[PDB]
């Protein structure tokens, strides 16, 4: 049991009892151990992330400018608690002492056309645009693209588009107070109407009610409407509550 | 069991104990092994792939700019991990250390008149009329030819033409907004006739 | 049988297999052998 031989692309962990720190054997290797030395486990085979792929690893090693590992001073690998990496495909990469995979091997969801991801931040962070995402927004990543995950942020749901056809007009009422695509404010609990034929994609903060299609109206019918509240119709013409045309 | 003769055109892969490196022994030898080293398995023919035809090998050796395979600075096989390789009709190359035969020789499936072959890219790629290819694309292949399959490439399915006659119109829905034969926008949901 | 120690002031015989050459190691070593090779005999005092 002095003697072991680690198969090409594999590694062990082996534990230094003098100063009680551990490390990893890499390579294809026979390798031979001291008596103060003890290995840990049996061989295992150094995970391999494909292409279009992703893996989580809790607790990664730190690095330096040049991306290398950093060791105490005692010979310790330097650690990061509490934290998780993003590893994308690459080079059979070992783990290190202290190092957990948190999620496999996993395939990179891509995202459907006409349909959106919708993403909140848990913790705080700095964006790709150049922005500060406090911990807590809400995004829409859509389009047809892939997602590649982060650490920080997490995926809520996926939302389809609604189709919207001729003469017709889809209410949506307001999560929160918030904006709306023609640009003008609306406040929780408002509800309108987004006219615009094809597929819609609601906003985080907007919500999809229901579809109301036009009523079709001839030389010998007429519609009767009562006022809600005060507005204006489509004629210009001012409305009070509860008056009738 | 040290000597051992391999017919021709097979091979075998021996393991070197002393670097823990393997290789493979190809021809019609007699081979003698030492004793520190080990041969694997009894002795498997190098297949061969005929003419139209095809076979994906997962884990492919790495090629020189001769494309002669490298090693490493070990003595081990120089290989490219999760890819996979496009292997045509060729000569009977051997399996090295660490190569998996993904899919055995197949029929090269031929595009039949008045059909397409549907084909979605699941990695990006860049063309062969020099365009570049994002994952998750959508084309047609269609006509008489033959395919030649991709790595990074998939058929989704096989789509039939319809036929129209003489005072017909064949209507059309749109999967996604799009644009026409006809060359004029479509959006999602919208309905068409094709004369 | 790898593993083998050969105290100080001493020695032991090693065969190689492959040319069927044989000679002898010296000094206070511990000593790993292939497995092609053989050891002769036990550790005998120089």
Same mark, same amino acid.
Not at 186 to 208: K, N, S
């Given at each position: ?25 890499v390579g294809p290797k026979t390798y031979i151990r ?28 730190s690095r330096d400018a040049q991306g290398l590992v ?31 995979? #948190?999620?496999?091997? @996993?395939?990179?969801?891509?995202? %459907? =056309? ?7 931040? !848990?913790? &705080? ?65 408002? #509800?309108?109407?987004? @006219?615009?034929?094809?597929?819609? %994609? =609601? ?7 229901? !579809?109301? &299609? ?25 409305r009070r509550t509860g008056e009738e045309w």
């Amino acid at each position: 049991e002095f003697i072991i031989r680690i198969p090409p692309y594999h590694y062990i962990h082996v534990l230094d009892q003098n100063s009680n720190v551990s490390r990893v054997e890499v390579g294809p290797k026979t390798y031979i151990r001291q008596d103060n030395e003890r290995v840990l486990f049996a061989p295992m085979r150094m995970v391999t992330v494909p292409p279009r792929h992703y893996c989580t690893v809790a607790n990664p090693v730190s690095r330096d400018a040049q991306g290398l590992v950093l060791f105490d001073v005692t010979g310790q690998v330097r650690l990061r608690h509490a934290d998780l990496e993003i590893r994308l495909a690459q080079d059979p990469f070992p783990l290190y002492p202290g190092e957990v995979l #948190e999620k496999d091997i @996993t395939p990179l969801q891509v995202v %459907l =056309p006409n349909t959106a991801l919708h993403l909140k931040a !848990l913790l &705080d962070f700095e964006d790709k645009d150049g922005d500060k995402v406090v911990a807590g927004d809400e995004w829409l990543f859509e389009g047809p693209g892939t997602y590649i995950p982060r650490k920080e942020v997490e995926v809520v749901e996926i939302i389809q588009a609604t189709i919207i056809r001729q003469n017709q007009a889809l209410r949506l009422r307001a999560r929160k107070e918030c904006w709306d695509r023609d640009g003008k404010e609306r406040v929780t609990g408002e #509800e309108w109407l987004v @006219t615009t034929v094809g597929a819609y %994609l =609601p906003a985080v903060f907007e919500e999809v009610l229901d !579809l109301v &299609d036009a009523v079709i109206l001839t030389e010998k019918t007429a519609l009767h409407l009562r006022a809600r509240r005060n507005f204006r119709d489509f004629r210009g013409v001012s409305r009070r509550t509860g008056e009738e045309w």
